[PDB]
Write a protein that binds this ligand. Structure first.
Ligand SMILES: O=C(Nc1cc(C2CCCC2)[nH]n1)c1ccc(F)cc1[N+](=O)[O-]
Ligand SMILES: O=C(Nc1cc(C2CCCC2)[nH]n1)c1ccc(F)cc1[N+](=O)[O-]
Ligand code: NA
Lengths: 305, 301
């Protein structure tokens, strides 16, 4: 019993984190095989950051301008290139702790673990969702750039996020490991803002299924609904649309708990219209949307890595 | 910016997790240097569950009755002893991934990370607090026994919890790494029930300081309180007493934000009276009590 916000074990990724220094800037890099990945903004001064020409800044740098430390050991940088908004430093040694891995780009609604790091040293692990507005609600201080996000699918680490910056509202923006931003952001010091966010409907339903599995049942009711009727309600309350694919994905949980997805949608409709009337679900007074259907099944079934 | 329930990176503990089998029972063990630690209830049978005599069950075992698997490798058990409610299996290999570590017994209100494990393999990491009633609100399935709780301030792992059992209310009980239970619990299937649980007041105050640090002041008020009047009110909402020690511990956060501890207590009193009126604090619609003052300073700097 119990249901907690749970991250993947972080050990396989811890063994890949390094410190990258360029001039007066220190941040984190990811060392896989013989390449260190980090944000390209490491090469900017403050003035450059206002309007950077990355190609022009980079051509002025030599390999020896990049100081890379893996724990207490310097790595030798033997090459440097850029891919979108990530810098790739070729080093002279393959990381002996490189896990089986892939680079994947995730979709809004999908969750991942973030290993927060400072000076190449992991400090904390937590679970995040990619918001519909392509931000994450992380917890990061100065020095955290280059921290990474990941899932583990078997013994394979899927790296999906590298941290680049904090937005004025205190939410976070970054790239996939091929250097493409999530969301309409750029790596420059200019006015940028998170768009208005929405709630991830399919995940709220997953979490209601988690609640039922753990014996929290007060919100269930006799009623069902249609996708179209529910979607009119979702739209009114700034919930993402529920699609038939979402319904299909929740199929297992529906069969296990005896609550059809549209039956659970009628529960959610009532919660949106009426509130919780002083009650909690899994210890929360808000509807939680950072567990995917996969997360719920994994945690309710004890899958290991 | 931001504020998240954040665990320690689990790698140093992952490298210590093994599978322990005795008879038909399999659970997790912790391999440090040449000793594997696990719950002594691994030696109980189905018969034994209510009133096991562990000394009598143990004397009947040989080293070779304990199967210890570290990844794909069997370890050889070369000795065994019981300390309180933990079994210590001496093995013929020192774990080459042993971190710097210590064993610490914690007090209610303290937080730690839990590495949930099944069959000696890590499943997930999350943050927990030792509740005032000496339980933890974990996430554990059958087979999770022997999972551990830890902090890693510095590069040294402080092991503070080993998981033993789930109580009927669905909360969790366990021991320190010297095998002494937290709270009045025993490793028997006899009827036992946790005390009524209460809110960890000092932690809620810490978390209100966190909200201020992160730019939120809506819940402050112009009032102050005496410590005794605060406690008289808070006990009515099932809050733990705040002690002068707790007031002292909040001093740094008070100095950082400019809000006196008893002024923050007055804010909390009003929140208990009023609720949040549709607002949130650090993304929550309830008052959060699983962040310590130390946790807040670590995360917020
Ligand atoms: O974003 C931050 N620092 C930055 C941004 C940039 C540039 C790089 C491209 C555009 C912006 N450089 N350094 C930041 C600030 C405060 C804080 F608490 C946390 C962070 N952080 O990192 O998440
Ligand atoms: O408590 C559980 N299993 C136990 C208890 C014992 C007793 C034998 C005498 C003292 C210990 N053995 N195995 C348990 C059961 C269901 C569940 F979802 C989770 C757990 N758990 O562990 O957290
Ligand atoms: Na219903």
């Amino acid at each position: 019993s119990g249901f907690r916000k749970m991250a993947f074990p972080s050990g396989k990724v811890e063994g890949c984190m390094v410190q990258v220094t360029c001039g007066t800037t220190t941040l984190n890099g990811l060392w896989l095989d013989d390449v260190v990945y980090c944000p390209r903004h490491v090469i900017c001064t403050s003035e450059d950051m206002l309007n950077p020409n990355y190609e022009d800044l980079l051509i002025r740098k030599s390999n020896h301008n990049f100081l890379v430390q893996a724990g207490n050991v310097q790595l030798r940088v033997i090459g440097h290139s850029m891919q979108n908004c990530v810098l790739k430093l070729k080093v002279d040694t393959a990381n002996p702790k490189t896990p089986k891995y892939k680079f994947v780009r995730i979709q809004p609604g999908q969750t991942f673990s973030v290993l927060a790091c400072y000076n190449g040293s992991p400090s904390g692990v937590y679970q995040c969702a990619m918001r519909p507005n392509f931000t994450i609600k992380g917890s990061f201080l100065n020095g955290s750039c280059g921290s990474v996000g990941f899932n583990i699918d078997y013994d394979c680490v899927s790296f999906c996020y590298m941290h680049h910056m904090e937005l004025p509202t205190g939410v976070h923006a970054g790239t996939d490991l091929e250097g493409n931003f999530y969301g309409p952001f750029v790596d420059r010091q200019t006015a940028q803002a998170a768009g208005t966010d929405t709630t991830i409907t399919v995940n709220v339903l997953a979490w209601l299924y988690a609640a039922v599995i753990n014996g929290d049942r007060w919100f269930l009711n006799r009623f069902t609904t249609t996708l179209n009727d529910f979607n009119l309600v979702a739209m009114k309350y700034n919930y993402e649309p529920l699609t038939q694919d979402h319904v299909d994905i929740l199929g297992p949980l529906s069969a296990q708990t005896g609550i059809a997805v549209l039956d659970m949608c009628a529960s959610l409709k009532e919660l949106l219209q009426n509130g919780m009337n002083g009650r909690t679900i899994l210890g929360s007074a808000l509807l939680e949307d950072e567990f995917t259907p996969f997360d719920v099944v994994r945690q309710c079934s004890g899958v290991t890595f």
